[PDB]
Design a protein around this ligand. Structure first.
Ligand SMILES: [Cl-]
Ligand SMILES: [Cl-]
Ligand SMILES: [Cl-]
Ligand SMILES: [Cl-]
Ligand SMILES: [Cl-]
Ligand SMILES: [Cl-]
Ligand SMILES: [Cl-]
Ligand SMILES: [Cl-]
Ligand SMILES: [Cl-]
Ligand SMILES: [Cl-]
Ligand code: NA
Ligand code: NA
Length: 129
């Protein structure tokens, strides 16, 4: 599924991400835009051989099992394929664990490089939330 901007904002808010660990909703939408272009089916291989899956590009090295990432963990206890669903529940639940891990949203390199320090409220402008 390719979400619309406000559609995704509403789904993330319903799942309790607005101000989760202090990160306003526009941070989460901005991250999703640059990670996946709001496409649940996005997959991208990393240099280390791991793969990032779904709307928030969650990595197989630590967070999900994809059966092909050596020496890796599965801290969200989920197959990576479940992160590609049109239902974002698994992605959101796993993201909540990631952002609690110590480094906040800096775990998402695209958030650090393209969202952090910007006017992220722009990402939810015009949405009925
Ligand atoms: Cl389709
Ligand atoms: Cl929308
Ligand atoms: Cl957009
Ligand atoms: Cl929802
Ligand atoms: Cl915001
Ligand atoms: Cl497997
Ligand atoms: Cl593996
Ligand atoms: Cl393969
Ligand atoms: Cl594990
Ligand atoms: Cl933080
Ligand atoms: Na990315
Ligand atoms: Na893994």
């Amino acid at each position: 599924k390719v979400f619309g901007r406000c559609e995704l904002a509403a789904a993330m808010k319903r799942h309790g991400l607005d101000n989760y660990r202090g990160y306003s909703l526009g941070n989460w939408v901005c991250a999703a835009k640059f990670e996946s272009n709001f496409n649940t089916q996005a997959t991208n291989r990393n240099t280390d051989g791991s793969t990032d899956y779904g709307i928030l590009q969650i990595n197989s090295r630590w967070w999900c099992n994809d059966g092909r990432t050596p020496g890796s963990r599965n801290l969200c206890n989920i197959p990576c394929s479940a992160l590609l669903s049109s239902d974002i529940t698994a992605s959101v639940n796993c993201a909540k664990k990631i952002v609690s891990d110590g480094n906040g949203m800096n775990a998402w390199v695209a958030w650090r490089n393209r969202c952090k320090g910007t006017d992220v409220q722009a990402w939810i402008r015009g949405c009925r939330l």
